[PDB]
Structures are given as structure tokens and as C-alpha cells.
């Protein structure tokens, strides 16, 4: 557990992991806090949540600097992330009570309804790629619902993890309602197996999700998994090509490519493929790579040496198999974990890369001849998180919406998360939904009540 | 896999388990069937579901005889079970389309909404205690939603399992949309690990649920677990005592005691405990034990020799520890797996039985002094399925509703399932909800759509 600046490779600060006894003490405190917190009014929870939003809104640049220092996303995009974190806090402050109101169903009972009550301690395991937003995405509805939470954040963002707890303390949430656990992956099993822990949510890779979900399953505890994707970005002949190129470039390269809903596989109708690809090539080549603290920077370093090694290998093996590099395709010879925007074409059938997530600014490009071929190729992956399709033909739009095997389909725009709309995967991308109504309904006891 | 009549102990018919190759073939057919079935209209699904209801409504006595023969519940209660099976078919026929309609949310999109689409093949693992109802509980919404299903039923109800498939075939559901798998517990892992199987649901005991959920978690597949309970039946001084005794007797002894939402622990306020307990004793004492095919029978045999052995041991060990037998407490000296209505009192603190499910007509009785003590004792179990409380004081009613740790709280009535209201557990009783809106929302892709 350490801050290692990916721009310089320098070790900035190390942290001692909690011991099992310390983890136990935190869970005992969470349980005690829950017994009181479940009795708080929505007005109190709303006040504290809105206070947290105001803290995020005031000190956006400072929080952004922590994110950038630890994991290398641009400071400007980290500012946006802090702003979006405030937004989801406000969303559940504004809607959470209504979303949890009794729902009455007419029967022969004098009263029959479902009410919604918190479960207790929720474990959250989170990744470094959106180190504030993913935490607030689960924490805002958890806290509004009256759950308490323990967070196991990624081992390379301890300062972000501590900052989130500090924000919630300063906002006024009682001690034990939210606790950051500075612990490694091997220490999570103790938490899942603790009788006081009632549920678990993980955003991350498949092996992490499989580990957490298998353990939780053994303990009869509900889970939600938000895993990776290889989202298609489909461009058809009636599309606004210049908009599609611009937006596609952002979709692939934002967050230095490290997003679950990045545009990863560009699927181009043959009628427009040559024009699109040339423009894509030019746009990618103009991106500014460098110090993520500089406001002009488009592409900072990848977050870790491991990610750099992995993408470098994935690309090298694809090229060895016969894939062509249109742009990029090799790590930069400079300090920090830098990998350039890359475009791969003519990838051989059966190449392993076709089935993998490229968690870096590396676009795979394909050409197709018709709608059926586009949909088949789009779905020919183990994942099913998001999908974007570009067309102004209403019949095509409807087929894309209906037939793309994903948790989200965006027509003529890049996939984005928005607190107003539920968000989650299908297939190997996970199950369950965050945000919207779903986010606050996942980890509550929907209690049926019948009164004679 | 066999029909063994629990009234006589006679082995009536044996069945060959499917081989792994045969299971694979059924999954291949389910996948092909799903590809077409997902394209059917709600009108077709509704027709087939309503046809299934009409079949159940016409031949209720015949289906009931199969249930009674295989697992020993009274023929009269099996008729009611067939009727309730028809009811949940009609519920989803009548509401399913509306329940799955697009839900629009205003954004800057021209259109933004959530739509609901089937996942694919759902595995269901079901128990012998309600061999028709629990199947239709999951199958009706699955089929209305456009999923297909494979059923692994309990090994002692193969004729029930085959009958459910035959009903659905006769109703018009296309081949492969629903398939009964005559397979043992060891064969379920293959099904969960098959890439075509997208989700799994289990109703049963904790070890079964832990096995299925841990395996599904490893495969990144969503689950729903409906497990056992030790539901409290709390009786306070303002209760209608005679009604509470009558209803409590039904709640403990229906289905020969073998219900997840049986009243298992009677928690009596000291002011009324003597009167209530005497009346409960009297009611249990005069229940008619005998051939479950006879309409006058209240109590048939327990379903299996294993259940009989288990309850006999649980009671014996409790008594050896110091518990008192007010009534019953030993197997009957006759053919078939008969165990009599039993009441245990004065159970020593720390006796293991206090924490166990009594899946037989055996009531544990406790006395308490006030509301706080009643709630504490009611919740002092690993389970949390249902809870019933009897009082006509509004303040007490509200505290019971709010503070009983269960998925369902019934005031002045016994806990029952009803298609109109969601149903499920908390704590070690499971997670997820069947019935109501919840039942048809569990295993669908909630797909967010955003159209510029
Ligand atoms: C949208 C945004 C992101 N994602 C998807 O997440 C992954 C990110 O990849 P990576 O950072 O490499 O994930 P990871 O799984 O290694 O780590 C994530 C967290 O899980 C912990 N962890 C790893 N392994 C385990 C085990 N076995 N048990 C418990 N916890 C584990 C990690 O801990 P450390 O190793 O850092 O200590 C970390 O906390 C991409 O696939 C991305 O697409 C999902 C999104 C969405 N759907 O919302
Ligand atoms: C309302 C009604 C019932 N219940 C709860 O269910 C159990 C019933 O007890 P029992 O019949 O003894 O359950 P079981 O778990 O042994 O068997 C149930 C099904 O699961 C299969 N099975 C057992 N073990 C496994 C494993 N390891 N893997 C997969 N499948 C398994 C059984 O198969 P067979 O052994 O018969 O072949 C069977 O299909 C009580 O606790 C009751 O309260 C839940 C209800 C509710 N919440 O809705």
C-alpha cells in the first residue's frame, strides 16, 4: 500500500496495512455505529450528504491533485471527477427518501406494503481508475439508505481512500458510518466472512469479482459486480462522421484509456471506414502526451507498471500474430508509465486480443458490410457493459438498441454514466445496477408488511 | 432419483439420471430455443401462461395426488398448492408486460429510458416441500420475461418435476423453453459452469444455497436464494388469543410442518402465556394424523426418512439438555415417516436447537416480559425470513413492523406468500425477492438507452 507517482515512477509514501485485529475493531465500530445510524432521519442523512457535496465542490482542485498524483489521470479530468462525485451525493440527497418510501399494494389487509430498510455493514471493493467517483457512486446511496460502509480501495490510491473518509467526517457523518480500510486483496476474505458484514459490492476486474462473489456466495450474502468491458463503437453510413470521430477519440482515450466504458472496438461500415479511420488516425496523433498536472495534457501515464507491461504484451502478441499498427504500439522512452494512443487494424481471426479488455488508449478497428455483421461482431465478446452506435436511420437505431448485448446502449453519443440512469453490466461484465433508483434499492431489505 | 411414498415407505418408481452429455444437449436446445423465444410477443407468452393456469385449474386433484404420493403433504393442501400455482401464472400473464415496460427518465437526450430484456437460460434448483408452487413461482415470471429455464428439482419428486414440464408443453410453450433435468445435486456444477447458463436461483437449505451461490459467484452470474427460517410468532396481551391459537396452529403444522415460513418459535407475553399455551397444547393434541390422501387428515408423514431422523435427533438432544416435552416428541410406531405435533418448553439457554430450523410440526415456546425482550428474542437467530406478531396496540404494531429482522412482517395474521407482494429473506434466509414486481425484474437485463 503506497503512493507511487506514475508520472515519475517515484515512491512518495508508504502505509502500514491494518492487522486482522484492527480490521475486527473497525467492524465492531461499524456495527455499533449502524445501530444508531439506522435510526437517523432522512433529514440528517441528507444534510451530511449535501455537506459532502459542498466540500467536494469547494476543494475540487485539491482533491483532483491527489487523484492525479496517485494514479495519473489528468488534473482537469480529476476535477470533473470530483464534480461528478458531488453530483451523485446531491442526487441521493434529493431523491433517496422518495426512492425508499413505502409502496402500498391493495389486498384484503387493512394495510399491505413494501418498506425499505438498511441491511447493515456493506463492504465495497473499489479500483484506482475513478478513485473518487466509484466510491461516491456506491457510498451516497448506501449512506442515504442508512447502511454503513467499509471501503477496501485499490492499494495504489491510499491517499484518495483516506481523503474520501475525511470528506465524510468533515461533512458530519458519525464515526463508524464510513471507514476506509487500508488493506490488501488477501485481507478481504476476513471482511466477507465476518458475521456483521451483510453484503458486498465490487468494481474491478473479473478475477477480483469472482473471488469476492464466490466468497460472499458461500456466506449467503448478496453482491453487485461492476466489471470490465470491451465496448463497441459502431459507425454506420448515415452517421455524422466528424462528430463520431471526435467523440470516439474522447471515448477511447479519456482517463488515459482506463475506463470500463471506453470505446475499445471501433466497428466501421465499409462505406465510411476509410474516411473515418484516416480522421481517427489524425485525431489520435494530435493528442498531447505528458504531465497530467498540465491543463493542456490529453494523455497522462498509465496508472501502474503492471498495466503498462500488460498492454505492451497484448499489443506485441497481436502484432506478432499479424495485426497491423496504424499508430503507436510501443511504450514511450521517457520516465513514467507512458503508452501512446494506438490504433490496431487487420487483427487476425482467433487472436486472443479480440476477447480481451484493452485498459489503455489502444483502439481495435474492424470493418463490416451490413447491420447483421455489425451486431454479431459487437456482441462477439465475453463482456457486455456498454455500446455506442452511430446512425440516423430509425430502423437501424432500433435494431442496435434492441440487439446489442450490453447493459447500456447509446445512439449518436458516447456511453457515459449519469446518476439519473441506472448503470451496470451483463455477461462477464457483471450484474446488478448502480445509480438511479436501482442504486439505492440494491442493498436494502425490501420488507413486505401485512396488517389485518 | 425415485418416487418413495412416505406414507408407506415403498419405493414406487426409479429414474435414470441424465449424463453430462445429455445435460449438455438440453442446454444446447435451451440456447436455440431462447434465440427464438426472446423474439415472441407478450401476447404469445401470455396465452401459453394462461393455458398453463387453465390446465392446473382443471386437473388440480390429479396433480395433487402426484404431490401427496411423492412427498406426503395432504391431498387437500396439494389441491390448494395447484390452485396457487395457477394463480401466479395468471398474475404474471396479467401484469408482466406492464411490469417490463420502458421507464423513461428526462435528460438532454431526445430519448432516455430503461428497457427490460431477458438474460437467457436460468437454472432453478427447487425443494420437495412445495413441489409445484415453488416451481411456478419462478417459472411464471421467467417465461413471461422471455427467459428460458432448466429445472433441477429435488430427487424425491421426479414425477412432480416431469408433470410441470408436461403442463408447460401442453400449454404451448415451445420445446426448450422449459426443461426438467432429472439430475442429482453433484450434477448442478456442470450447469452453473456452462457458458450458456446466465443466472441461477435456488430455494432450499443453506448448504445447497452456499454451494450454488459460491459456484455462480466464481462464474460472475447473478443469483437469488430463498432459504429456511425459524420464524417467530409473537403474541401480546391485546391480541385476539383464540384467533392467534387457531392461526398459529395452522402456521406451525401446515404442510406437515415443512414450510420455510412455518411459525417455529412462539414468543408469548407472560400476561397471556398460560392461557395461550394451554390452548395451543389442546389444538395440537387433537390434530388428525394419518393417510394424507384422506380429506380429514391434518398431518401426513414427513417427506423423507432423513427429515424424520433429523427432527427426532434435534428433539432428543434438546430434551437431554433439559427441554420439556408438553406434547409429542417421538416418532410414531407405524409405517411411514410419521412424527407427531410436538411442543417444547423451558429450552435451556445455549441449546443448539434454539438456532436451528425445525422442519416438522414441532413448536418451541418461550415467555417474555415486554416488547424489547420479545423483539430481541425474535431476532436472536441466524435466519430472517418471516415474522408474525399479534397485538392491537398501534405503537406495538409499529415497533414490531420496524424492528423485527425479517423479509416479511405480518400483524394479526400468519405469514403467507401472495403473488401480489414480493417474498424473500434476509440474514441467512437468503437475498433477492420473488413475486410482485420483483419476481419479474430479478433476472432481466435492465438496459439503459440514450438516444441523442
Ligand atoms: C468502470 C470502471 C472500472 N471497471 C473495471 O475495473 C477494472 C480495473 O482493473 P484493475 O484496476 O486491474 O482491477 P483489480 O480487479 O486488479 O482491482 C480492483 C480492486 O479489487 C481488489 N482486488 C483485486 N483482487 C482481489 C481479490 N482476489 N479479492 C479481493 N479484492 C481484490 C484490488 O485491490 P488491490 O490489489 O489494489 O489491493 C482493488 O481494490 C477494469 O476491468 C475496469 O473496466 C468497472 C467499471 C464499472 N462496471 O462500473
Ligand atoms: C420456502 C420453502 C422452503 N425453503 C427452505 O428449503 C429447505 C428445504 O429443505 P431440504 O428439502 O432439506 O433442502 P435441500 O437444500 O437439501 O434440497 C433443496 C434442493 O437443492 C438440491 N441440492 C442440495 N444440495 C445441493 C448442492 N450442493 N448443489 C446443488 N443443489 C443441491 C436438492 O437436490 P437433491 O439433493 O434432492 O438431489 C434439492 O433440489 C428448508 O430450509 C426450507 O425452509 C425456502 C423457502 C423460501 N424462502 O421461499
Superfamily of domain covering B1-228+419-452: Aldehyde Dehydrogenase; Chain A, domain 1 (3.40.605.10)
- DSSP designation for A446: E
Is B246 labeled as catalytic in the residue annotation? Answer: no
Which A residues in the span 399-428 are in contact with B, Cβ-Cβ below 8 Å?
401-402, 406-413, 418, 420-424, 426-428
Q: Is A436 left (phi over 0), alpha (psi -120 to 50) or beta?
A: left
Nearest CB neighbour to A407, from listed B105, B420, B448: B448
Tell me if A89 sits within 8 A of A263, measured CB to CB. no
User: Ligand 1 centre and the CA of A205: distance in Å?
Assistant: 5
| Distance of alpha carbon B428 from alpha carbon B213, whole angstroms | 13
B302 Cβ below 6 A of ligand 2: no
Closest-CA residue of B relative to A205 is: B220
The nearest alpha carbon in chain A to B103 belongs to A421
Residue A306 Cα: closest atom of ligand 1? 12
Residue reference for cell 427464438: B36
What is the resolution of the experimental data for this entry, in Å? 1.4
Instruction: Say how far apart CA A138 and CA A115 lie, in whole Å.
Output: 21
Tell whether A395 is within 8 A of chain B (Cβ). Answer: no
Look at the alpha carbons of B59, B63, B64, B66 in this order and tell me if their dihedral is positive or negative: positive
- Cβ contact B209:A220 at 8 Å: yes
**Phi, then psi, of A107 in degrees rounded to 5:** -140, -170
Judged by its nearest atom, the ligand closest to the C-alpha of residue B186 is: 2
Any B CB within 8 A of A38 CB? no
Backbone angles phi, psi at A432, to 5 degrees: 85, 165
Task: Output the nine-digit C-alpha cell for A167.
Answer: 470528506
Pairing status of strand A111-118 against strand A444-451 = antiparallel
The pick from A1, A185, A226, A442 for probing ligand 1's pocket by mutation, whose C-beta has the most ligand atoms within 8 angstroms, reads A185
- Taking CA atoms, what residue in A is nearest to B205? A220
β B103-104/B111-118 pair status: antiparallel
Active site residue A226: yes
Task: Of A33, A218, A217, give the one whose Cα is nearest residue A118.
Answer: A33
Give the integer Cα–Cα distance in Å for B285 and B341: 7
Distance of alpha carbon B172 from alpha carbon B338, whole angstroms: 40
C-alpha cell at A18: 491494518
Closest CA to A6 of A411, A302, A246: A302
Q: Which helix (H) or strand (E) holds A35?
A: helix A20-37
Alpha helices in A38-131 (DSSP H): 42-58, 60-71, 75-99
User: Of A195, A193, A196, A183, which is closest to residue A216 (Cα–Cα)?
Assistant: A193
Q: Report residue A406 as a C-alpha cell.
A: 450490453
How far does chain A reach from its first CA to its final CA, in angstroms?
Answer: 56
Q: Tell whether A239 lies on the interface with B, counting CB pairs under 8 A.
A: no
Contact between residue A445 and residue A117 where contact means Cβ atoms under 8 Å apart: yes
Q: How far is CA A206 from the centre of its chain?
A: 13
Query: How many Cα atoms sit within 13 Å of A25 on the Cβ side?
Result: 5
User: Which residues in chain B are closer than 8 Å to A221, comparing Cβ atoms?
Assistant: 431
* Out of A214, A220, A406, closest to residue B227 by CB: A220
Q: Which residues contact B284 (CB under 8 A, 6 or more apart)?
A: B249, B252, B253, B327, B328, B341, B342, B343, B361, B363
Question: Would you tell me the crossing angle of helices A394-403 and A371-379 to the nearest 10 degrees?
Answer: 20
Q: Which residues pair with A446 in a beta bridge?
A: A116
- Count of alpha carbons within 13 Å of A130, Cβ hemisphere only? 25
Name the closest ligand to CA B133: 2
Q: CB under 8 Å to B441, separation ≥6 — which residues?
A: B99, B116
Q: Decide: A244 and A276 in contact? Cβ < 8 Å.
A: yes
A217: which chain B residues are within 8 Å (Cβ-Cβ)? 210, 212-217, 223
Pair type for strands A263-269 and A231-235 = parallel
> Is A451 in Cβ contact with B412 (below 8 Å)?
yes
By the 10 Å C-beta count (0-12 exposed, 13-18 middle, 19+ buried), B11 is classed as exposed
Residue pair B84/B95 in contact by the 8 Å Cβ criterion: no
A97 neighbors A126 (Cβ within 8 angstroms): no
- Cβ distance B450 to A387 under 8 Å? no
Distance CA A251, CA A389 (A): 12
Chain A (50-89) residues lying within 8 Å, Cβ to Cβ, of chain B? none
Contact A234, A389 (CB under 8 A): yes
Neighbours of B403 (CB within 10 A): 17
Whether A232 contacts A387, CB under 8 Å: yes
- Calculate how far, in angstroms, residue B259's C-alpha sits from the geometric centre of ligand 1: 41
Q: Do strands A386-390 and A231-235 pair parallel, antiparallel, or not at all (unpaired)?
A: parallel
- Distance (angstroms) between ligand 1 centre and the Cα of A3 equals 17
Rounded CA-CA distance A359/B260 in Å is: 47
A7: closest CA of chain B, how far (Å)? 34
Task: Check residue A336 and give left, alpha or beta (phi > 0: left; psi -120 to 50: alpha).
Answer: left
Cα-flanking dihedrals φ and ψ of residue A13, to 5°? -160, 140
* Out of B220, B406, B426, closest to residue A225 by CB: B220
Cell 474491478 -> residue: A204
- Can you spell out the DSSP letters for A203-269? ES-HHHHHHHHHHHHHTT--EEEE----EEEEE-TTS-HHHHHHHHHHHHHGGGG--TTSEEEEEEE
Q: Which of B263, B225, B22, B253 is nearest to B127 (CA)?
A: B225
Task: Give the closest residue to A389 by CA, choosing from A426, A380, A398, A407.
Answer: A398
| 3-state DSSP of chain B | CEEECCCCCCEEEECCCCCHHHHHHHHHHHHHHHHHHCCCCHHHHHHHHHHHHHHHHHCHHHHHHHHHHHHCCCHHHHHHHHHHHHHHHHHHHHHHHHHCCCEECCCCCCEEEEEEEECCEEEEECCCCCCCHHHHHHHHHHHHHCCEEEEECCCCCHHHHHHHHHHHHHHCCCCCCEEECCCCHHHHHHHHHCCCEEEEEEECCHHHHHHHHHHHHHCCCCEEEECCCCEEEEECCCCCHHHHHHHHHHHHHHHHHCCCCCEEEEEEEHHHHHHHHHHHHHHHHCCCECCCCCCCCCECCCCCHHHHHHHHHHHHHHHHHCCEEEECCCCCCCCCCCCCCEEEECCCCCCHHHHCCCCCCEEEEEEECCHHHHHHHHHCCCCCCEEEEECCCHHHHHHHHHHCCCCEEEECCCCCCCCCCCECCCHHHEECCECHHHHHHCCEEEEEEEEC
Taking the C-alpha atoms of residue A116 and residue B399, their distance in angstroms, rounded to an integer, is: 15
Are the beta carbons of B234 and B387 closer than 8 angstroms? yes
B258 CB within 6 A, ligand 2: no
Torsion sign across C-alpha atoms A410, A414, A419, A420: negative
User: Which CATH number, 3.40.309.10, 3.40.640.10, 3.40.50.720, 1.20.58.2030, labels domain A229-418?
Assistant: 3.40.309.10
A157 close to A118: Cβ distance less than 8 angstroms: no
Question: Where does ligand 1 bind, in terms of residues with CB under 6 Å?
Answer: A 125-129, 152-155, 184-185, 188, 203-205, 208, 211-212, 226-229, 259-260, 357, 359, 385, 425
Q: In what order do the strands lie in the sheet with B342-345?
A: A103-104, A111-118, A444-451, B408-411, B386-390, B231-235, B263-269, B362-368, B342-345, B324-327
Cβ contact, residue pair B213, A220, below 8 Å? yes
| Residues in Cβ contact with B95 at an 8 Å cutoff, skipping those fewer than 6 apart | none
Catalytically annotated residue among A50, A89, A160, A260: A260
A277: cell is 479511420
Grid coordinates standing for B130?
A: 412445495
Experimental technique of record = X-ray
A344 three-class SS? strand
Q: What is the residue extent of each domain of chain A?
A: 1-228+419-452, 229-418
- Dihedral pair phi/psi, residue B323, rounded to 5°: -60, 150
Give the sign of the dihedral formed by CA A319, CA A324, CA A329, CA A330. Answer: positive
For B438, which of A411, A446, A447 is closest by C-beta distance?
Answer: A446
Going through A93-156 in order, the beta strands assigned E by DSSP cover 103-104, 111-118, 121-125, 148-152
Q: How many residues does chain A have?
A: 452
Q: C-alpha distances in angstroms, B129 versus A17, A303, B49, B71, B84?
A: 49, 54, 23, 7, 14
Inspect the interface and report whether the beta carbons of A447 and B409 lie closer than 8 Å. Answer: yes
User: Binding site for NADPH: which residues of A?
Assistant: 126, 128-129, 137, 152, 155, 204-205, 211, 226-227, 260, 357
Amino acid at each position: 500500500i503506497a503512493t507511487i507517482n506514475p508520472t515519475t515512477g517515484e515512491i512518495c509514501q508508504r502505509f502500514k496495512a491494518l492487522t486482522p485485529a484492527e480490521i475486527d475493531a473497525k467492524l465492531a465500530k461499524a456495527q455499533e455505529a449502524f445501530q444508531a445510524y439506522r435510526r437517523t432521519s432522512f433529514s440528517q442523512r441528507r444534510q451530511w450528504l449535501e455537506n459532502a457535496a459542498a466540500i467536494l465542490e469547494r476543494d475540487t482542485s485539491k482533491f483532483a491533485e491527489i487523484m492525479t498524483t496517485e494514479m495519473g489521470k489528468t488534473h482537469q479530468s480529476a476535477i470533473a471527477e470530483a464534480e461528478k462525485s458531488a453530483l451523485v451525493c446531491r442526487y441521493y440527497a434529493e431523491h433517496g427518501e422518495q426512492f425508499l418510501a413505502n409502496e402500498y399494494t391493495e389486498t384484503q389487509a387493512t394495510e399491505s406494503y413494501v418498506c425499505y430498510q438498511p441491511l447493515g455493514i456493506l463492504l465495497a471493493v473499489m479500483p484506482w481508475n475513478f478513485p473518487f467517483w466509484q466510491v461516491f457512486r456506491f457510498a451516497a446511496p448506501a449512506l442515504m439508505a442508512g447502511n454503513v460502509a467499509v471501503l477496501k480501495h485499490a492499494s495504489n490510491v491510499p491517499q484518495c481512500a483516506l481523503a474520501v473518509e475525511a470528506i465524510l467526517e468533515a461533512a458530519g457523518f458519525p464515526e463508524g458510518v464510513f471507514q476506509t480500510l487500508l488493506i490488501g486483496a488477501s485481507q478481504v476474505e476476513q471482511v466477507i466472512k465476518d458475521p456483521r458484514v451483510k453484503a458486498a459490492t465490487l468494481t474491478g476486474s473479473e478475477p477480483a469479482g469472482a473471488s469476492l462473489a464466490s466468497l460472499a456466495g458461500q456466506e449467503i450474502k448478496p453482491t453487485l459486480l461492476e466489471l470490465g468491458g470491451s465496448d463497441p463503437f459502431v459507425v454506420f453510413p448515415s452517421a455524422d462522421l466528424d462528430e463520431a470521430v471526435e467523440v470516439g477519440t474522447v471515448a477511447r482515450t479519456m482517463n488515459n484509456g482506463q475506463s470500463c466504458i471506453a470505446a475499445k472496438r471501433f466497428i466501421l461500415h465499409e462505406a465510411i471506414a476509410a474516411e473515418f479511420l484516416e480522421k481517427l488516425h489524425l485525431k489520435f496523433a494530435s493528442l498531447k502526451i505528458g504531465d497530467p498536472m498540465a491543463p493542456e495534457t490529453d494523455i497522462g501515464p498509465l496508472a501502474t507498471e503492471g498495466i503498462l507491461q500488460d498492454i505492451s504484451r497484448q499489443v506485441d502478441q497481436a502484432v506478432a500474430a499479424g495485426a497491423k499498427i496504424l499508430l503507436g504500439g510501443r511504450p514511450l522512452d521517457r520516465a513514467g508509465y507512458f503508452y501512446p494512443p494506438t490504433i490496431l487494424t487487420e487483427i487476425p481471426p482467433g487472436a486472443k486480443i479480440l476477447q480481451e479488455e484493452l485498459f489503455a488508449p489502444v483502439a481495435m478497428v474492424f470493418t463490416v458490410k451490413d447491420l447483421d455483421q455489425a451486431i454479431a461482431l459487437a456482441n462477439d465478446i465475453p463482456f457486455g457493459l456498454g455500446a455506442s452506435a452511430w446512425t440516423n436511420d430509425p430502423a437501424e437505431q432500433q435494431r442496435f438498441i434492441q440487439e446489442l448485448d450490453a447493459g447500456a446502449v447509446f445512439i449518436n453519443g458516447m456511453v457515459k454514466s449519469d446518476p439519473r440512469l441506472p448503470f451496470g453490466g451483463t455477461k462477464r461484465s457483471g450484474y446488478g445496477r448502480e445509480l438511479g433508483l436501482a442504486g439505492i434499492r440494491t442493498f436494502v431489505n425490501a420488507k413486505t408488511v401485512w396488517l389485518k
